[model samples]
Target: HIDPPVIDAGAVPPDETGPDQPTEQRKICATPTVMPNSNFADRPWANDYLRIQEAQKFATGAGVTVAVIDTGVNGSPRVPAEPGGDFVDAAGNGMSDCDAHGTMTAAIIGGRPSPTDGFVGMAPDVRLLSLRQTSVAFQPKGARQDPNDPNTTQTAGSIRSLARSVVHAANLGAQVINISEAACYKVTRRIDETSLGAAINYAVNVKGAVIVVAAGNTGQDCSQNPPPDPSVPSDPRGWREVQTIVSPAWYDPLVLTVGSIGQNGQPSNFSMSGPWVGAAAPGENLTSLGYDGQPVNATPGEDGPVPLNGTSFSAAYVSGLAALVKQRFPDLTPAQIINRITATARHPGGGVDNYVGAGVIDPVAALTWEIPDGPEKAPFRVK
Candidate 1:
């Protein structure tokens, strides 16, 4: 009964014209700066929690292709082998990483290990496909802006552009697609998400690709009321109070939405919650390869390295897990792979809650668990 609208990748949707209009004008691109390589001699806590070393013995995600659809991924020791198309700028390719967000997420999924640092990706052997879909440093060519403040220019990419990127990634033989970006809308607004929804449907049903999305972070656009009690496991005032709709993640059945958790195994306060969330992963105090060819725990800032934290990175961890699952059980469908992850996760007390979904992902358990054979049971269903 799920009737997904048909999408025409050739023609831009009407809604893509306003703030998200594409421009041909040249852009001022600046490379991100990083501090001197810090010695992260010990493996990241997330790596240890998942027992990544033990899981790799089974499958290294050798042949699977996971596409990173975000700010372009720049060339580095750990960069993707295959460069994808660019939807942000007309003159740009997929190998440019001015914002550094995309590169970090890409590294988290498949950055190769080095002798200098103990850090390593969950599925290091997987082939990475970088599709430049968004950027903070690059602005649309002819958009109105403030002369005094260069930062006034709106960031690049929209739902329509994101839709095109999804289709492009799927067509390019990407078995797994990682979307670390999200567009949030007010619950009262009647937004048209058809174009994006259709594209996701095409990727999943027609192209047979697994889509992983971030649950989204709380900000001015997506606001959450102050929790009455922080220590409580489940809050009664849930999504109803938030009153925000996160696109791509809101497309529950079509994608696996991931929330963020800290090393203590508790959900991060900033991670947005909803019924669509599938699971959680370590998203705080994390370290990953930077665009500058060094190990980093945060992104470049005006003063110094800004500590990196968000559900975006959490989704990357799950995306890496998807790659591992795909390689290990080649016959399992996308839904089956998603189900295995949720089913095997360490369930939170009182069953599924709004914060961490089923619970934090358990990589070794997911890779080793046995399931009865039948039609794959949908992970999220009407209660």
Candidate 2:
């Protein structure tokens, strides 16, 4: 195999700091940054970048736009939060990130560092549209932004709030919308109707855009939880099995669904997976910039930056891969874009397992049919 990738001598998994139980963990901080000089060789995550670049891919994710619907992006000098690109507020969270989640997602996918002398992102030149869906006022307790309503629903749930934002992001020129957040697992009645799922679909299939959803963590199907209560009994629609993935995840029929994979080229146990999973990329223990201009250790986080995980990082990786695809195939529609990635993905190991669908994503392989061609193109990468 890959010689059994070495594990950092001292690192803590994110779940350690999180709630004892998945259901109990209320608020999660948006700490996407963990350390300084992570861009250097010492950072374990650096290996991915080296691999991506050695393949003669600079990521060139520009010209197109990817919108994020989460706690707004904070592009301030105070705390890091880099992906604070141009956006019109809809969640009414004031267009600034109260949590590190959204900005971190945006940054990893296409962030350009501060003062002109910092870390480089996978798609540093791309355009970003931060469509806020998360609200600080809704945060739970124990976490930095907690104490509001641990089970607080997104403030932008109303049709007016979500649809407007989706349309706005599309109009603003976003070709892809990445949602790092997801409702609890389970399918209930009318719950889907009330969610912003419809609006996301319109943004992609209807508005000439593509949507990417984080197949919620916990490895549980969303149809079962159904939000507020997986069995929010109202009577109707009868989604019998309730196993069709999460909400927005199940929303855009034309959009692509991305799941998370760890650095070792294995399905992330914490990452939710299913047939709907069309692609996979690095997610667990990912190191990147966070709210304080410092790097947030992507879990296995101990004492340093905030521990972070979930499918958020996977969506970013997918978005970047999409951007690369777009660069090569500009004429392709959002649907076509999805096809290029899905059709070309390698079968990881077991090939197309429920988790690491179509194997680990090879950006070079994404452009060609050969699996090793991407990695083969860059022999200098050494790793």
C-alpha lDDT values of all predictions:
0.74, 0.53
Q: Which candidate is the best by TM-score?
A: 1
Give TM-scores for every candidate, taking all chains together and pairing residue i with residue i: 0.84, 0.67
What pairs collide in candidate 1?
none
Q: Give the TM-score of candidate 1.
A: 0.84
Q: After best superposition, candidate 2 residue 221: deviation in angstroms?
A: 9.5
Question: What lDDT tens digits, residue by residue, belong to model 1 across residues 1-383?
Answer: 11212334334333221224555434455444434665588898889977888888877788999999878787676656468777776666678776767888888899888888888888898899888777765556664655433223232136767887887888889999999877776545435556677777677766889899998898866664333243543654244445666768877657988999988888899998875677889888788887655677876567866766889899999999999999989888778888788888875473566677788888888888896433443333221
Name the lDDT of candidate 1.
0.74
Model 2, span 233-338: residue lDDT tens: 4422223324433544544235566777776666677766544456777777665665554555653246655445667678777777777667666766677777
TM-score between model 2 and native: 0.67
Point out where model 1 deviates above 4 Å. Answer: 1-20, 24-37, 143-157, 225-242, 373-383
